[PDB]
Symmetry: D2
Subunit: 356 residues, 4 copies
């Protein structure tokens, strides 16, 4: 009998509350794709939400979908046209890969390309499996002094990088970050790395705020039942001034209103968190003080920069990982996520290496 | 007896529905100010609103306030430190003059200076009178080939210049302008002068849209009871694509929502129109497609540019003037404004010259 | 006997002074390429220089090269993956097509991609022939009201568009354009279309300056033997001020120095013309007044905008065409170019349609 | 007899090699000025150059000029219109203060205002004395946790802040800094604080490079007689890529050329160093790869930011101070500077407090 073939066990969502571990064919890379032996994949609210509700807004799982989109792996095989990667290369995978070179791509904002492929966003299958193929241009080699988990953390870190860029965060800025979830945390890390003089972080959880303090938050504010205006007042009282940039990472209407009231005139309020379709806010207040309201849709051109920051030890995201499980314990990992006691949970897909 | 002294008849609002023509002392210019013999002053909804309600938002007339803030005049006398202006110079007056060189002025956005002085915005007296003194740095000499009325029209034109700048309007753009009032009209003029390939103007009035066409609107849409999504659909239908920039000049919530749905991803929605304190809008929609929402608060650094555009005949604002009255007929002029049949009404304050 | 096959007569440069018309195989389009029946191709100094010297700097013809890179044509056949174009579509061809999605492409500046393919720049064959294949993403459909020659003129127009963007040309600017060659002319057209209040054009030829006047030049200055400082003085005297932007389209050292001396502090000097490897200039003068010196390497993201400006009749480049010849008279066309009496010479490659 | 009056001993240059300590009248502050009891004043090559040659370029000392322009002090008295400062306030003094609100000030680039007043640049007297009056808008209160010397170091630090801003230095960038003098050093500090992943510093002195390493330089290159291309090659060799930004802080022609060759395409070469009037450089090389060349003229809008960075301990400039002398030993301090063995020399003007 022939030698046993490799397997491609994958974590799949079939519908609400229907999560399964099942085998998939081994992908074959096209001329400009590479086949990756998946190593580390972090999970986030998006994956868990698809599992629980089978959808996220207009994004609905109409057919079984493989989850996972924050990952790194090892190049197993390369397509006939791939030149910058070779078997054995450790790489970080940027999940959003444009299908066509449209005007958004040409202008440098490929994240807005309407037909972009994106891991784990229906109908595009994610990378929480053994073997995964991806456009080679969006697989970035990791330096030897950067771990697989760091490579996987580049995905959430990139949201923070993109958010701070969109907000214009720069040297000496006083920045308000609403929310101490993993997104608010990476935003904090990026803001400090970009030279923000003071970063104030808010959240409903004292626990998450204490963690924020641990990694650099200069000031923290636990939100209980204060009004948006009161929050803005407390933030300003703590900073001794109004923050030039507010990065909203909760998606909560009250927080958005607070961001509008708190941001300095001529400043920028970046909306990262996703809330409901409609939001009632004091637009007049923001518009009249020229406080710009800029949204964020994932990211663009952040992987090389993230890798440079990690390789130079300019930022430390390792503290973000609070738990790791092998791919096979995905269900246990998802249930753990729901407990909401951690931050970032890593899934280890390569049986030959379960290390960071 | 001595020769008769000059007079400074002024148009003053004492409260809701209390408009009066009364004499004021002749201002004496300080070292860095100039005394102007007012010539042409255009009036707008702001002046009329202070007349009708004695206030606009939180800006309330607590003591009689002279109206007018869109003006030009002739330098009568100059302060001991003034050197760029001399008696006889025809000048356009920029109404907003900072009282202190704060961080906003230093960074180039003096319009956001908290303590800025602004004509006809309580408690600062306007210039609808015979003689008015103003900071010399904010009085700009008009070239011989630019009329006083064009000089007065620089104020509303500047709102359009600032709005298009904030929106990033540039060569080849498809621009949507919501509202065909004088503000939407100057915005249309500026957008076209900046190279916009197509400008679509919307409004409830067919008459205003017809006028928009006359001065350059490539396409127009009369709005009735369509929903914001339907408006967005129609605009896109006319353009065959989504406008990269939308300049909202109505303040109507429905129009703001339409702008969010209509604007191309990565584009900009500029909020010029003033509406209610709170607004319900689809921020999530704008965020996911990175449609920036930028407000406008008057303007900054637009007078020299406006003057250059007028002197080179790059724009023609004259069609905006639909009526002109001598200062003494200010009441009739405000009554005519209330008829909402015109566009821009000019008040002529210099008895020696009532010409454009 | 079988029907006669089509031909692909091409204009080829074999070495200095060795220009030949010879037949080439009919290209076969790959999955994302389209085969074009070439219609109109404009020629410029680059093509003529390759013919005369067999090279341009480090760009040397090491093997016979087909000339031509300013063109338009009709889609003859489309690759299996092409979706936005179909046979019969009239298209404008952007000559620079990236071979790989590197960081320059992702960041929105594909013109800087080191491995970019570019028509008629050794070793990449141009499109002065009957049939030519090209990446479909870089073939743009022409509206019915835009001619083939206009489509071909988009290439030089794009240099002007890119140059003005790089220079920050905007509403009300006083712009100095050095050189009245076709590049200086399209720059002039673009500057005016972007809202420049006054454009001053310089040149050694009164003839070219008169042509410049005809298409919009507000002011012209024929250069004889004045020094750079004298030129700067005359330009300022004519404008009554220093231009905020200077676009150098001659590549001449003296002109570059003049641009440095003439540009307003805080302004921008754009270098479009190609001179010698080294240039002696008053860097200190520019640097100390923060006059930025920005170069231009062809263009990026200008075709859709150019098409929008042409389709909306916002700019008129037709006056630029001073002569047209069928492909077969290429030698006569090149000799005519050398006479330097015209501006843009068009080659007509489609025997079935020799019209504009 | 009456009580002894205070003195205003000043360090004055009468001409080449003619430095004197002499008494000046005590300045009386105007309505918008403040009188400062000078505390700490750092000296730099500019002060020393005026001493040695009695001039710098076209700025010539035609009458005795008080030196010093990098200072901090204590508010002694305030003008009748000053409200943001009071007696006893510790403040940092920004030396460049505009005399008129011209278009440069209005646009946010007051450093380019032609009539700007600037300490110790003939004919404007500096602040190396006991009492000095200055525009109140340009005196910034220092937080309690920021020393007077740090306040004085804000001036050179601001050159670095402005330079990095002009260069677009940001997160993850690889930056090349040419020159390890105090200017290159502060530039290094700022680049790292702004998130640069790697900063390479070059210099002729191994000692200065060793000091650069001590404060953060990731890589250093000692320059001997290598050519500009060789320097560019070596820099790239160390980084494994080309730096996105190069900040030239030597003024040496060879270094400027190296910067052009070394900078990544689409990147920026910032010219801070002052050299000869004319410079021979490969502009064609920079243009073809769109390497922008931006000069720096002091700074604008950097004091509040510097103060925020110092108060938050985001940067440490203290290591730059290599020696401190009381005002009375100014001659010895200038002699020590000429020994070129230190970096930043501080002069202590307040006899009541000679501490940092
Ligand atoms: N736009 C994008 O591209 C993108 C990509 C990733 C995540 N997101 C979104 O960003 C948001 C943050 O995600 P995450 O993983 O950090 O989520 P999370 O749930 O882990 O963290 C959100 C935090 O907000 C806090 N919070 C809730 N309401 C608050 C309020 N009113 N005031 C202050 N704090 C409040 C919560 O206690 C929590 O710690 C989510 O809405 C997520 O969907 C956006
Ligand atoms: N932010 C600023 O600095 C600033 C300065 C000037 C004016 N403004 C504001 O800009 C707005 C425009 O003022 P204006 O003088 O042109 O006013 P206006 O009343 O003359 O014109 C407003 C126009 O909007 C139209 N309109 C109303 N609802 C509409 C809708 N749903 N769809 C389309 N069109 C609609 C009206 O028919 C009218 O023609 C006002 O709200 C004014 O207060 C702002
Ligand atoms: N960087 C790019 O991507 C790019 C692409 C196209 C062309 N170019 C370059 O732009 C330049 C202009 O090309 P073109 O087709 O218009 O060339 P051209 O030869 O037709 O025109 C150049 C003009 O400059 C004038 N001139 C020469 N020296 C002058 C001086 N000292 N003062 C004033 N005028 C002077 C000439 O009389 C002539 O009219 C060339 O150097 C060309 O190679 C650059
Ligand atoms: N533009 C402005 O606003 C402004 C303000 C401050 C200083 N500056 C200028 O910036 C420059 C830096 O001044 P500073 O105080 O640091 O001077 P400095 O003399 O202390 O330092 C200059 C350094 O350059 C090094 N150097 C010289 N030639 C070199 C070369 N070819 N390669 C590499 N290194 C080389 C020297 O060894 C020295 O360490 C000076 O030219 C100064 O005039 C400009
Ligand atoms: Zn995620
Ligand atoms: Zn008005
Ligand atoms: Zn060409
Ligand atoms: Zn100094």
């Amino acid at each position: 009998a022939a030698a046993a073939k490799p397997n491609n066990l994958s974590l799949v969502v079939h519908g609400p509350g229907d999560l399964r571990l099942e085998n998939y064919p081994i992908p074959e890379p096209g001329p400009n794709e590479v086949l990756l032996r998946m190593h580390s994949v972090g999970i986030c609210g998006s994956d868990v939400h698809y599992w629980e509700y089978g959808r996220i807004g207009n994004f609905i799982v109409k057919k079984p979908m493989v989850l996972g989109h924050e990952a790194s792996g090892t190049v197993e095989k390369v397509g006939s046209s791939v030149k910058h990667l070779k078997p054995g290369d450790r790489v970080a995978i940027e999940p959003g890969a444009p299908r066509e070179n449209d005007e958004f791509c040409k202008m440098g904002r490929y994240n807005l390309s309407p037909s972009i492929f994106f891991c784990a966003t229906p109908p595009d299958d994610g990378n929480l499996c053994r073997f995964y193929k991806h456009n080679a241009a969006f697989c970035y080699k990791l330096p030897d002094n950067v771990t697989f988990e760091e490579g996987a953390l580049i995905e959430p870190l990139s949201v923070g990088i993109h958010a701070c860029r969109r907000g214009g965060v720069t040297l000496g800025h006083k920045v308000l970050v609403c929310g101490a979830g993993p997104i608010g945390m990476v935003t904090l890390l990026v803001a400090k790395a970009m030279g923000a003089a003071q970063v104030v972080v808010t959240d409903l959880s004292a626990t998450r705020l204490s963690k924020a303090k641990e990694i650099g938050a200069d000031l923290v504010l636990q939100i209980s039942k204060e009004s948006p205006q009161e929050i803005a007042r407390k933030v300003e009282g703590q900073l001794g001034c109004k923050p030039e940039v507010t990065i909203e990472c909760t998606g909560a209407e009250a927080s958005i209103q607070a961001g509008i009231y708190a941001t300095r005139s001529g400043g920028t309020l970046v909306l990262v968190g996703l809330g409901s379709e409609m939001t009632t806010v004091p637009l007049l207040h923001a518009a009249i003080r020229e406080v710009d309201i800029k949204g964020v849709f994932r990211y663009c051109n952040t992987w090389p920069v993230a890798i440079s920051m990690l390789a130079s030890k300019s930022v430390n995201v390792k503290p973000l990982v609070t738990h790791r499980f092998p791919l096979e314990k995905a269900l246990e990992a998802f249930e753990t996520f729901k407990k909401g006691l951690g931050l970032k949970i890593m899934l280890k897909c390569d049986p030959s290496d379960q290390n960071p």
